[PDB]
Amino acid sequence: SNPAKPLDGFRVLDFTQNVAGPLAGQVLVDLGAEVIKVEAPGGEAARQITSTYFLPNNRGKKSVTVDLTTEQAKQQMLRLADTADVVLEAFRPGTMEKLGLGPDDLRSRNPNLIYARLTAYGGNGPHGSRPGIDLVVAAEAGMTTGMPTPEGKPQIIPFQLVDNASGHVLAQAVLAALLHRERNGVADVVQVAMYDVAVGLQANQLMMHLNRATQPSDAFRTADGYIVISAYVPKHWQKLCYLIGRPDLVEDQRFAEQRSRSINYAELTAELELALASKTATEWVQLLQANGLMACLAHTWKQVVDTPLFAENDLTLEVGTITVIRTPARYASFRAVVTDPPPTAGEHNAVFL
Amino acid sequence: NPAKPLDGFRVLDFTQNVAGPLAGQVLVDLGAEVIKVEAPGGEAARQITPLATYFLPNNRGKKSVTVDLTTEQAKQQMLRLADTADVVLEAFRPGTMEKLGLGPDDLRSRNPNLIYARLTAYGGNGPHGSRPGIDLVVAAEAGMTTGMPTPEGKPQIIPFQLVDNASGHVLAQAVLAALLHRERNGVADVVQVAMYDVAVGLQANQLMMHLNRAQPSDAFRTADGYIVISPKHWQKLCYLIGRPDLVEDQRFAEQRSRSINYAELTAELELALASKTATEWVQLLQANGLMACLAHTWKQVVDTPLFAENDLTLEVGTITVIRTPARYASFRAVVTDPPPTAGEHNAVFL
């Protein structure tokens, strides 16, 4: 058996490119929807990149090649749009409208269609008019705050956190829209902005500035490497002290309470580091983890994939044979995995064309 | 007052802290009725942060119920409550609810419409996943510290809770899929979301590199400050910079030419971009259709025009919060009510 999936029998038009838009469509595929990629003749840019970028996010999709400039294609797209339940677009504002395949057009012809648009900054006003990628959006939304570089340069995070988070957020909106149409008969217009998601991820830090304005929980030096320890909770902090051989700290003046600990850290780091000199980080992690503490090694990407934890959670699936990482959400009724390969560019031309 | 997608849905939110409560918050914004099950004193996140940071922003428009889960009375109360509900959120330890009698089998046998959603640090799929976790520890363990040099040589820790919020959104997405699943296929599923798996997904492209063994975009210097400046762009940048080189150096040349020259690539650009202030550099570049910006700090971000333009904040009795990011046309996915006080709706649901 292939057990029923939540989006079985829905069809999505995926006009998106790169990572964020596609991730959302990939989630839709994983949930059983039929997602048809609409790509330029030759294929998306991503296919060509790094001989790679493309394979994770496009497995189990269909593909159609069409030149958006041409009226014939426009017409082909219009006819295709009528049978679609959802449309994904990640172009700049007004470009879809210019193409004659804008929201108002498709919604006029198809009253049931859900239109989801993903943008870097949002089409709202002159400052959101611009184009963006993960890096620039992250920097602009303040993601480099509070991290110091030896050269004094802004710390740029090496992974596509905004693109990836936005992709999931866009998936969320489409599911909410689909439920909305199912229970209220409304074909909504959904908008997700990359800047909005990026701001969301730092919301707690941003909140501090919005209204007229935890120790220990850091990475500490050992004999051989760094260990990450978070043990500021009361039961936890005393257990940490006993374990590292300093019971004076548990009740000692200046570290007794979290506020003191938090205020007084520098000294805390010194005491803790002096104590942690006695063992290697791996030794310490084994000790603390056994005693119910939250401690780990700051793994590198090469290390993470070779850990038992990564193996335990079945994060990888083979594609018929490249290995890719699956979407996080997991379900008991069906597998939110899919094993088919990505469509070749325009593979499903004539099926839908 | 228009219909919202989750109108007439009820959720039991046993979750605490940030991630799970953020899921419940997304559900609230979408019109679901979310009832928080809290401890007798209260959530304790209320005490943890004046303004209660990490509590107020994510529990608006919710209900609160105060109950001692250990006692049998509460167990029965929870059981009756469960029956009325559509979804249940749990962020406890991988064995705790079943121990409390509110386990997936227990609640779902009684309620065939009930969706049971579990949020965990590591999943609970084995010995290695049998640990408790927090945003920092999960982020570090998932490899988020990689590639970022620090003055001390210490691992770089991202000072915001990315894993928490991302996981909140993924849990929300998973709950929505389950509801749609129950709507269209008549199945009430057991959703599982692990913070570790979410974190792994955020770095998937990078992780992909190490799973199958066999630029130009960065921040750069200027006269004042730094400018993030990520074919035509290539030409446009050099042209606009006041420098001829596109293939002139030849080390610039094709995009691949950064390998071995990237560090050098930056320096001419650095010298070039001392000719004016960083703000000016961003203005010139943006006008040409270039992707550039300032590396804003959090204080700078809230006073930007771009932030103001996107209606990111809402007032709530006042206190200012940032809204959930997805936007709909048919309705506004925002709620202006405050968080409930502890046990506020104990009379109504018990």
Active site residue A163: yes
User: In this complex, which of A7, A158, A289 lies closest to B180 when CB atoms are compared?
Assistant: A7
Contact B5, A178 (CB under 8 A): no
Task: Please give the Cα distance from B63 to B89 (Å, whole number).
Answer: 14
Q: What resolution in angstroms, rounded to 1 decimal?
A: 2.8
Nearest CA in chain A to B323: A200
Minimum distance, in Å, between the CA of residue B336 and any CA atom of chain A: 17
Task: Please give the Cα distance from A164 to A161 (Å, whole number).
Answer: 5
Domain shared by A286 and A192, yes or no: no
Strand order across the B226-228 sheet: B219-221, B226-228, B293-294
Any idea what DSSP says for residue A88? E
Domain shared by A95 and A211, yes or no: yes
φ, ψ dihedrals at A27, nearest 5°: -65, -40
Which tokens in the block code for residue B139? Answer: 């982020």
φ, ψ dihedrals at B147, nearest 5°: 85, 0
Task: Please give the Cα distance from B151 to B161 (Å, whole number).
Answer: 22
Q: Which of A165, A295, A96, A202 is nearest to B203 (CA)?
A: A165
A 10 A CB-CB count for B63 gives 21
- Sign for the pseudo-dihedral over CA of B211, B213, B217, B219: positive
Selected catalytic residue, list A85, A134, A163, A188: A163
Q: Between β-strands A86-89 and A114-119, what pairing exists: parallel, antiparallel or unpaired? A: parallel
- Sign for the pseudo-dihedral over CA of A114, A120, A126, A130: negative
Contact A181, A115 (CB under 8 A): no
Minimum distance, in Å, between the CA of residue A314 and any CA atom of chain B: 9
Strand partners, B33: B10
Residue located via tokens 């104990």: B346
Interface test with A, best of B56, B202, B232 (most A CBs within 10 A): B202
Contact A61, A39 (CB under 8 A): no
Q: What residues contact residue A23 under an 8 Å CB cut-off, 6+ apart?
A: A57, A163, A164, A167, A168, A170, A171
Pairwise CB contact (< 8 Å): A324 & B211: yes
Any idea what DSSP says for residue B127? G
Residues in chain A within 8 Å Cβ distance of B219:
139, 144, 153-154, 156
Distances (CA, A) of B349 to B12, B34, B40, B62: 11, 12, 15, 13
Which tokens in the block code for residue A306? Answer: 């070779």
Nearest CA in chain A to B326: A192
The experimental method behind these coordinates is X-ray
User: In this complex, which of A128, A164, A211 lies closest to B319 when CB atoms are compared?
Assistant: A211
Which tokens in the block code for residue A248? Answer: 């004076």
Minimum distance, in Å, between the CA of residue A108 and any CA atom of chain B: 15
Q: What residues contact residue A94 under an 8 Å CB cut-off, 6+ apart?
A: A123
User: In this complex, which of A153, A175, A302 lies closest to B177 when CB atoms are compared?
Assistant: A175
Distances (CA, A) of A268 to A111, A116, A233, A287, B140: 63, 50, 15, 20, 21
Pairwise CB contact (< 8 Å): A135 & B191: no
Domain shared by A67 and A209, yes or no: yes
Nearest CA in chain B to A4: B185
Three-state DSSP state, A281: helix
Task: Please give the Cα distance from B51 to B36 (Å, whole number).
Answer: 20
Nearest CA in chain A to B54: A204
Domain shared by B33 and B56, yes or no: yes
Task: Please give the Cα distance from A261 to B99 (Å, whole number).
Answer: 35
How many CA atoms within 13 Å lie on the side-chain side of A156?
A: 22
Residues in chain B within 8 Å Cβ distance of A113:
none
- Sign for the pseudo-dihedral over CA of A250, A256, A262, A265: negative
Pairwise CB contact (< 8 Å): B306 & A140: yes
Asked if the peptide bond before residue B305 counts as cis, ω within 30 degrees of 0, the response is no
Q: Which of A114, A92, A104 is nearest to A12 (CA)?
A: A114
Q: Which helix (H) or strand (E) holds A296?
A: strand A294-297
Task: Please give the Cα distance from B112 to A139 (Å, whole number).
Answer: 47
Three-state DSSP state, A97: helix
Domain shared by A133 and A159, yes or no: yes
Any idea what DSSP says for residue A65? E
Q: Which of A81, A75, A121, A129 is nearest to A104 (CA)?
A: A81
φ, ψ dihedrals at A270, nearest 5°: -65, -50
φ, ψ dihedrals at B326, nearest 5°: -65, 140
Return the axis-axis angle of helices A20-30 and A161-184, rounded to nearest 10°.
50
Task: Please give the Cα distance from A5 to B18 (Å, whole number).
Answer: 30
Residues in chain B within 8 Å Cβ distance of A314:
125
Domain shared by A223 and A92, yes or no: no
Return the axis-axis angle of helices B162-185 and B19-29, rounded to nearest 10°.
50
Which tokens in the block code for residue B115? Answer: 């969706």
Which tokens in the block code for residue A305? Answer: 């994939």
Asked if the peptide bond before residue B216 counts as cis, ω within 30 degrees of 0, the response is yes
Domain shared by A45 and A64, yes or no: yes
Interface test with B, best of A28, A221, A325 (most B CBs within 10 A): A325
Domain shared by B242 and B196, yes or no: no
Domain shared by B2 and B36, yes or no: yes
Contact A97, A103 (CB under 8 A): yes
Domain shared by A127 and A242, yes or no: no
Contact B224, B169 (CB under 8 A): no
Using DSSP, how many helices (H) and how many strands (E) does chain A show?
A: 17, 12
Which tokens in the block code for residue B182? Answer: 């129950």
Domain assignment of residue B67, given as a range = 1-218+297-350
Q: What residues contact residue A34 under an 8 Å CB cut-off, 6+ apart?
A: A9, A10, A11, A12, A62
Rg (C-alpha) for chain A, rounded Å, is: 25
User: In this complex, which of A6, A295, A309 lies closest to B128 when CB atoms are compared?
Assistant: A309
Pairwise CB contact (< 8 Å): B137 & A196: no
Minimum distance, in Å, between the CA of residue A24 and any CA atom of chain B: 11
User: In this complex, which of B53, B230, B325 lies closest to A135 when CB atoms are compared?
Assistant: B230
Q: Which helix (H) or strand (E) holds A297?
A: strand A294-297
Which tokens in the block code for residue A201? Answer: 């991820």
Nearest CA in chain A to B331: A188
Q: Which of B304, B324, B303 is nearest to B312 (CA)?
A: B324
Structural domains of chain A, count:
2
A 10 A CB-CB count for B69 gives 20
- Sign for the pseudo-dihedral over CA of B150, B156, B157, B158: positive
Domain shared by A93 and A22, yes or no: yes
Any idea what DSSP says for residue B129? G
Which tokens in the block code for residue A269? Answer: 């780091």
Domain shared by A211 and A343, yes or no: yes
Beta strands in chain B (DSSP E): 10-13, 33-38, 63-66, 87-90, 115-120, 190-194, 219-221, 226-228, 293-294, 313-316, 319-322, 327-328
Task: Give the end of a domain, one of B296, B323, B340.
Answer: B296
Nearest CA in chain B to A295: B137
Task: Please give the Cα distance from B190 to B104 (Å, whole number).
Answer: 8
Residue located via tokens 């010139």: B284
Contact B12, B21 (CB under 8 A): no
Residue located via tokens 């501090």: A208
- Single-letter residue type at A246: R
Selected catalytic residue, list B106, B164, B189, B197: B164
- Single-letter residue type at A241: C
Task: Give the end of a domain, one of A254, A273, A299.
Answer: A299
Task: Give the end of a domain, one of A262, A280, A299.
Answer: A299
Q: Per 3-state DSSP, what percentage of chain A is helix, strand, and coil (rounded to 5)? A: 40, 15, 45
Pairwise CB contact (< 8 Å): B286 & A130: yes
| φ/ψ bin of B153: left (φ > 0), alpha (ψ from -120 to 50), beta (otherwise) | left
- Single-letter residue type at A314: D
User: For residue B8, with 0-12 CB atoms within 10 Å meaning exposed, 13-18 middle and 19 or more buried, which class applies?
Assistant: exposed
Residues in chain B within 8 Å Cβ distance of A217:
134, 136
